[PDB]
Amino acid sequence: AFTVTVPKDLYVVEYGSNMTIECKFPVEKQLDLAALIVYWEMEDKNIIQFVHGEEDLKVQHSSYRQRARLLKDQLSLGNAALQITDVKLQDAGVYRCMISYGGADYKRITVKVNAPYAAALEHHH
Amino acid sequence: AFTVTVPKDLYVVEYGSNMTIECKFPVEKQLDLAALIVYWEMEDKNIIQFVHGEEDLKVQHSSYRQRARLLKDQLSLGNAALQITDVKLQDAGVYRCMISYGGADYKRITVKVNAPYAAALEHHHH
Numbered sequence: 413a414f415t416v417t418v419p420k421d422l423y424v425v426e427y428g429s430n431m432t433i434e435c436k437f438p439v440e441k442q443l444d445l446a447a448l449i450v451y452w453e454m455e456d457k458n459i460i461q462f463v464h465g466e467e468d469l470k471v472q473h474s475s476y477r478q479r480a481r482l483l484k485d486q487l488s489l490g491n492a493a494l495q496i497t498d499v500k501l502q503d504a505g506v507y508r509c510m511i512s513y514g515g516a517d518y519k520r521i522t523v524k525v526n527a528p529y530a531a532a533l534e535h536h537h
Numbered sequence: 538a539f540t541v542t543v544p545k546d547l548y549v550v551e552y553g554s555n556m557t558i559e560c561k562f563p564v565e566k567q568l569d570l571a572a573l574i575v576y577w578e579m580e581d582k583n584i585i586q587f588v589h590g591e592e593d594l595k596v597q598h599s600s601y602r603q604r605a606r607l608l609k610d611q612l613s614l615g616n617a618a619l620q621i622t623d624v625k626l627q628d629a630g631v632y633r634c635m636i637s638y639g640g641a642d643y644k645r646i647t648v649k650v651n652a653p654y655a656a657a658l659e660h661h662h663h
């Protein structure tokens with residue numbers, strides 16, 4: 413059936429860097445964008461909502477606005493790729509990509525963020 | 538748009554009893570049973586996978602085998618109802634109902650499990 417595949421289940425990124433996380437779905441010939449549904453979330457916090465042919469930024473979290481973008485060019489090739497710029501300590505956790513394209517499946521990705529003492533002290537408050 | 542509806546966000550059930558948790562999805566005409574996908578989960582642990590008309594328990598956690606079943610009759614009016622037999626202290630947590638039927642949505646449900654001392658002390662060890 414329809415199964416989403418993740419090439420890498422764990423990402424290790426440095427503080428302030430940019431990370432692009434990848435999950436893949438099977439594409440037959442072209443993209444019926446009127447049926448593609450991509451939901452990117454981490455810890456019950458929406459990052460990006462792809463419904464119809466565009467993004468639904470009505471539920472995107474503020475912490476991920478101006479930092480999160482799904483590579484629309486890669487959706488043709490069946491790669492729902494989410495990019496987060498300036499990864500911070502709070503971007504560590506379990507991410508979930510849910511894709512609906514005829515079928516439906518989801519896969520989880522765990523992100524670990526290394527950081528220097530200064531940035532870590534900031535998270536400790 | 539397509540929205541999943543939960544009549545109850547919190548369940549309070551007794552140890553050893555039977556519990557049925559309900560999430561609801563809108564059906565206008567009939568079932569595209571080739572397009573209905575129902576995922577019942579608890580804390581990144583699959584409970585039930587309803588794809589193409591039947592259940593695919595191939596990813597079901599061992600803790601739920603022989604106890605979890607999706608009520609196929611309630612699918613008539615958009616009721617994806619999950620029943621757990623022998624609710625245990627380990628069955629407490631955040632459940633997730635994920636449905637794809639002409640769109641996609643999911644909602645979370647929290648289950649609290651009361652239990653007598655004997656079952657709790659036994660669960661507190663091992």
Ligand SMILES: COc1cc(CN[C@@H](CO)C(=O)O)nc(Nc2cccc(-c3ccccc3)c2C)n1
Nearest residue numbers: 451510511512516538539635636637640641642643
């Ligand atoms: C939390 O909100 C939203 C919103 C949306 C879409 N946005 C609109 C659509 O109409 C809205 O429903 O609001 N999809 C999602 N999850 C999602 C996305 C894709 C597939 C699946 C899925 C379904 C069955 C099995 C496995 C995965 C799921 C759960 N979650």
